[PDB]
Amino acid sequence: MTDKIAVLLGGTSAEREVSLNSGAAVLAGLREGGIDAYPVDPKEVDVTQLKSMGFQKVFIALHGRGGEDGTLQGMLELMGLPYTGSGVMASALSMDKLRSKLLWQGAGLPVAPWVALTRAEFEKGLSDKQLAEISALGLPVIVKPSREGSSVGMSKVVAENALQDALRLAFQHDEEVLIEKWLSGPEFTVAILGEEILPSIRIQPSGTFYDYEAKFLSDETQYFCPAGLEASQEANLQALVLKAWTTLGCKGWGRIDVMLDSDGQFYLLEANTSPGMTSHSLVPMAARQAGMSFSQLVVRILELAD
Ligand SMILES: Nc1ncnc2c1ncn2[C@@H]1O[C@H](COP(=O)(O)OP(=O)(O)O)[C@@H](O)[C@H]1O
Ligand SMILES: C[C@@H](C[P@@](=O)(OP(=O)(O)O)[C@@H](C)N)C(=O)O
Ligand SMILES: [Mg+2]
Ligand SMILES: [Mg+2]
Structure with a gap:
């Protein structure tokens, strides 16, 4: 009987494996509660067809860029599908x-005191006064990619001497990075x-x-x-x-x-x-x-x- 709910899981971000596990969970939870839920992975299926497929609503269980950044929600808004x-x-x-x-x-x-860096500024060399604003934060400090989750790309740096390697790891995940005071x-x-x-x-x-x-x-x-x-x-x-x-x-x-x-x-x-x-x-x-x-x-x- 009519009323298909799409459960979007997986995807392609760095949080993909976590999302397949969140989806498995939600799929059973929804079915246990009487819902006719279907597992849809945007890496496998073209989600731009969700409407042509007969789904009434979308339960979003994606984590990270592609599912939590507003692009996916933008599309569903124009397609007319209610979503979580x-x-x-x-x-x-x-x-x-x-x-x-x-x-x-x-x-x-x-909000904890911080300093933002772009990959470009990093590649060009940290204009030493850059370090002057970073040292003003006190040590230790935490380096993290701007658009990640699940502690991906992060690290703790005790003393200015360790900052380079930390920034190099973070910039592997995003072009904008934050360095914030360690709480x-x-x-x-x-x-x-x-x-x-x-x-x-x-x-x-x-x-x-x-x-x-x-x-x-x-x-x-x-x-x-x-x-x-x-x-x-x-x-x-x-x-x-x-x-x-x-x-x-x-x-x-x-x-x-x-x-x-x-x-x-x-x-x-x-x-x-x-x-x-x-x-x-x-x-x-x-x-x-x-x-x-x-x-x-x-x-x-x-x-x-x-
Ligand atoms: N300023 C900070 N000082 C100390 N620990 C921090 C700080 N910022 C983040 N953390 C630690 O890092 C973890 C992940 O950071 P968070 O900002 O929550 O990003 P994510 O989206 O990856 O979870 C936190 O749960 C906490 O354990
Ligand atoms: C540990 C936490 C992860 P998450 O929800 O949040 P964090 O960004 O803090 O990792 C993540 C999927 N983005 C959880 O599943 O509840
Ligand atoms: Mg997060
Ligand atoms: Mg977090």
Whole structure:
């Protein structure tokens, strides 16, 4: 019987394997909840044919450029297919950490001190005063590609001596890079589903930072849901995250990453518009604590599609 939902997974970004795992999860969750869901991989299928195929809605489970940057949402807007998550502007804006930062800081929101570099400036040689602005950040510092996820392309540099290799790795993934002040932690994440914010999660990695391996591969990562903060701080977290969410213009569902620093204040890291839904993912963890089943959450996200 009529009513086909397309579940977009895989893709070609550096987050492809993670996305196939998020898709597998969502496909079962949706079917368990009575939905006639179909797995569609844009690397295999021409998604520009989604409408000619009979699909009524699209559940986006892609991660990274191509699925979270607004291009895919742009097409679906012209094709007329309701879809999950944020619109074109919010998605394009959330993917770019340098631009989410300008926006956030411009709105008065807490963002860690940073320096942006383009591959060109890097190739030409860092005009030494470049280093003067980077050393003013203090050490250590964190280097990250502007448009990535899953800790791809990042690294920590203790002392200016290590900066070159770090920048060379980051520029392999993007032409625009950020170098930001290293925050002490702990680290937090806060998921949003519609007009509601789920209970906070505090992440605790075994190594240097929450890397690729700590996110999807090791059983050493600890999580605490709720965070364990006093109501006063738990309150401050939601207020911040909600303002971060609305300034960006996001909607549907998402997850914002935050961290504490030595001055006892919260700092925005980034916002993700199409979060992971694998067995190691944070969003499913928060919903569980909020009393929902994996099926319920997924079914709810699709309910929010527009
Ligand atoms: N300024 C920072 N200071 C300390 N750790 C950071 C900082 N920025 C990022 N991290 C760490 O790096 C991880 C990944 O960075 P994030 O900005 O959230 O990008 P991604 O989209 O790859 O997740 C974070 O979860 C955290 O563990
Ligand atoms: C660990 C996290 C990953 P992810 O949602 O977010 P990050 O950008 O922080 O990795 C990612 C897919 N883009 C999760 O699946 O919940
Ligand atoms: Mg991210
Ligand atoms: Mg993150």
